[PDB]
Design a binder for this molecule. Structure first.
Ligand SMILES: [Ca+2]
Ligand SMILES: [Ca+2]
Ligand SMILES: [Ca+2]
Ligand SMILES: [Ca+2]
Ligand SMILES: [Cl-]
Ligand SMILES: [Cl-]
Ligand SMILES: [Cl-]
Ligand SMILES: [Cl-]
Ligand SMILES: [Cl-]
Ligand SMILES: [Cl-]
Ligand SMILES: [Cl-]
Ligand SMILES: [Cl-]
Ligand SMILES: [Cl-]
Ligand SMILES: [Cl-]
Ligand SMILES: [Cl-]
Ligand SMILES: [Cl-]
Ligand SMILES: [Cl-]
Ligand SMILES: [Cl-]
Ligand SMILES: [Cl-]
Ligand SMILES: [Cl-]
Ligand SMILES: [Cl-]
Ligand SMILES: [Cl-]
Ligand SMILES: [Cl-]
Ligand SMILES: [Cl-]
Ligand SMILES: [Cl-]
Ligand SMILES: [Cl-]
Ligand SMILES: [Cl-]
Ligand SMILES: [Cl-]
Ligand SMILES: [Cl-]
Ligand SMILES: [Cl-]
Ligand SMILES: [Cl-]
Ligand SMILES: [Cl-]
Ligand SMILES: [Cl-]
Ligand SMILES: [Cl-]
Ligand SMILES: [Cl-]
Ligand SMILES: [Cl-]
Ligand SMILES: [Cl-]
Ligand SMILES: [Cl-]
Ligand SMILES: [Cl-]
Ligand SMILES: [Cl-]
Ligand SMILES: [Cl-]
Ligand SMILES: [Cl-]
Ligand SMILES: [Cl-]
Ligand SMILES: [Cl-]
Ligand SMILES: [Cl-]
Ligand SMILES: [Mg+2]
Ligand SMILES: [Mg+2]
Ligand SMILES: [Mg+2]
Ligand SMILES: [Mg+2]
Ligand SMILES: [Mg+2]
Ligand SMILES: [Mg+2]
Ligand SMILES: [Mg+2]
Ligand SMILES: [Mg+2]
Ligand SMILES: [Mg+2]
Ligand SMILES: [Mg+2]
Ligand SMILES: [Pt+2]
Ligand SMILES: [Pt+2]
Ligand SMILES: [Pt+2]
Ligand SMILES: [Pt+2]
Lengths: 172, 172, 172, 172
């Protein structure tokens, strides 16, 4: 047993390892989306920049969970990072809709994690999730919702002009 | 009787209290409009910013009238601030049209106030209204008229692209 | 249904709308108190400044709740802002006592809101209330208690000298 | 006839000369009050400073009216500046009450002047009075009312401590 471990349930330790994998997966999804918009037949550079930034932020999320695992005396257990569901993302609107779906899935996982930490009476872990993850997810979901709304109202995905101008004015 | 009161008719005092309520009501209308554009299914952030600024300016209008009431030795008398007429505002164009209607109503009230102050031979109150309120209203009405015109000519409310681009270029 | 809504109970949405109204009401109470101390027959300018600042902070509280409602995909629903219970506030001590009563009422409402968010297993909303509201209320109640104590010990409300000197030394 | 004179009634010219005398009289009253508080058996230096500043501001009021008389092509006509009604002012409270009475008398004269300018359809003179005099009088009367209120509530004129502390905190 770790000399630092205190009030840290084995189930919570396992759930944190699963969350680490999911954050790394989200980083990979955003990396894929980013370079889709870097293709010469898509060519929306601020979509590409926006999703690359999101990819780096997910890697930071994963690193913070790994730090937490060690802080609490759990042991990190890594699994394969699955490739994203799509190779081709269709349009800026469809990529934003996929990102919204991804972030709501990550939020569900975090809420299940919080439920477990509550059930195991682990207030440090509850506070860690609330401080570093839950409002970040709410802000990310709201931003992506805003983006989807604007792209739809502007006429995407049929209007390539709409995605071009959104790239310049909102993401630029 | 107030030791400072001089040439200040009871009718003028009452009219100033009514105007205080109307300025607070206009602040509330603009607050409601602002957060309509903050909804995830509307998502026009500079419309939201513009109307929040207008809301704060109406609260300043109300505060200046309360200051005036005390300066002249009248006594402030507050009433409920009614909720705005709408919960949902439809479109950026419709909100601008509502704001134009609101500002012309506030201007009519101020012109009736000035008529009363003229009838009661109160030149200090006439000058207060002319200095701090009447040209402010004329400028606000002209600005909102300009905004309505541009949104109509651009194709709003049917063109969501129009409202998006107006948000960026005129309100941004 | 809102595309962003996740784990946000209809009861919580309604409770947030009620809290928005209560924050706007508290802003109005403090606005009324402020201009009471601006009267020529009261004339305590730092009492007036103190309560005007408190009024603006309550409007910020309300705005943050409106932002939260939209962040979570709820829909804002406004009601009339009732006029405060008093027109005349009697003395600096009595106004401070009224403010203490108001802030403890607002705190009770926030604690009921937190109880509901706990019952609906909404950790994001619990954390929002704890981060932005609960300690703010505890600090405000403690400050107002301190102020009431000092005014009583100095001899208020009978000693107009006491309220004058408190205006200069504590609020100045 | 003056080569510049236009729309300037002989009655208005005479009324402006009377107002010049009244402004010079108010300057003299405040000069007398100032040096009352400089006496070794009164010895309130910030009362003395406050009334000396008021005296200089009244001389500026008079100079501006003399400038106006020449601007409009009227001819200045001076009369004796009467000595103030009192040699001894009793107390800081009594001097403030006298100043309040003086400023309300000056305001009545200005309102009669404005009534005359209105009757003679002289909008330049109306605007001059409203811009440079009427709100200045309202602010001065409100300030003096505030001061009287505070001195009374603190226990003046019986409390020499009250006048001492008002001298330091409000006028200092
Ligand atoms: Ca596979
Ligand atoms: Ca109603
Ligand atoms: Ca009522
Ligand atoms: Ca004589
Ligand atoms: Cl343990
Ligand atoms: Cl343990
Ligand atoms: Cl365990
Ligand atoms: Cl594991
Ligand atoms: Cl996983
Ligand atoms: Cl694996
Ligand atoms: Cl967070
Ligand atoms: Cl947000
Ligand atoms: Cl936030
Ligand atoms: Cl469409
Ligand atoms: Cl009168
Ligand atoms: Cl009157
Ligand atoms: Cl009357
Ligand atoms: Cl009234
Ligand atoms: Cl009204
Ligand atoms: Cl009412
Ligand atoms: Cl104006
Ligand atoms: Cl203009
Ligand atoms: Cl202008
Ligand atoms: Cl059209
Ligand atoms: Cl859900
Ligand atoms: Cl939900
Ligand atoms: Cl529900
Ligand atoms: Cl509701
Ligand atoms: Cl409520
Ligand atoms: Cl209602
Ligand atoms: Cl807090
Ligand atoms: Cl504290
Ligand atoms: Cl604290
Ligand atoms: Cl007592
Ligand atoms: Cl002291
Ligand atoms: Cl002429
Ligand atoms: Cl002439
Ligand atoms: Cl003539
Ligand atoms: Cl003459
Ligand atoms: Cl005279
Ligand atoms: Cl003479
Ligand atoms: Cl003025
Ligand atoms: Cl004032
Ligand atoms: Cl003013
Ligand atoms: Cl007394
Ligand atoms: Mg992110
Ligand atoms: Mg993440
Ligand atoms: Mg405005
Ligand atoms: Mg206004
Ligand atoms: Mg506060
Ligand atoms: Mg509050
Ligand atoms: Mg908790
Ligand atoms: Mg002066
Ligand atoms: Mg003068
Ligand atoms: Mg006029
Ligand atoms: Pt997808
Ligand atoms: Pt409307
Ligand atoms: Pt009360
Ligand atoms: Pt006198």
């Amino acid at each position: 047993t770790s000399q630092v471990r205190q009030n840290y349930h084995q189930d919570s330790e396992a759930a944190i390892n699963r969350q680490i994998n999911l954050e790394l997966y989200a980083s990979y999804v955003y990396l894929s989306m980013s370079y889709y918009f870097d293709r010469d037949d898509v060519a929306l550079k601020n979509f590409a920049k926006y999703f690359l930034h999101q990819s780096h932020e997910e890697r930071e999320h994963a690193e913070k969970l790994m730090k937490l695992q060690n802080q609490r005396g759990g042991r990190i257990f890594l699994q394969d990072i699955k490739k994203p569901d799509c190779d081709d993302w269709e349009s800026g609107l469809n990529a934003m809709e996929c990102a919204l779906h991804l972030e709501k899935n990550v939020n569900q996982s975090l809420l299940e994690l919080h439920k477990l930490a509550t059930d195991k009476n682990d207030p440090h872990l509850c506070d860690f999730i609330e401080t570093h993850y839950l409002n970040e997810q709410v802000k990310a979901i709201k931003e992506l919702g805003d983006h989807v709304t604007n792209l739809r109202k502007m006429g995407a995905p049929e209007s390539g002009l709409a995605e071009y101008l959104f790239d310049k004015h909102t993401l630029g």
